Amino acid sequence: QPLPTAIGLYKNHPLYALKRHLLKYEAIYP
């Protein structure tokens, strides 16, 4: 499973995340 083929699958994904899918209190660190 290299990557899901759909962007919408990354929303609330247990293992993957996207910058556009970050919530108000969520951010990528580091």
Classify the C-alpha dihedral 27-21-18-4 as positive or negative.
positive
Q: Helices then strands (H, E): number in the chain?
A: 0, 0
Residue entry with tokens 């929303």: 11
Contacts of 4-8 spanning 24+ positions with Cβ under 8 A: none
Supply 15's token pair.
């293992």
- What is d(CA 3, CA 11) in angstroms, rounded to the nearest whole number? 13
User: Are the C-beta atoms of residues 10 and 18 closer than 8 Å to each other?
Assistant: yes
User: Are the C-beta atoms of residues 28 and 19 closer than 8 Å to each other?
Assistant: yes
Q: Hey, is 12 helix, strand or coil?
A: coil
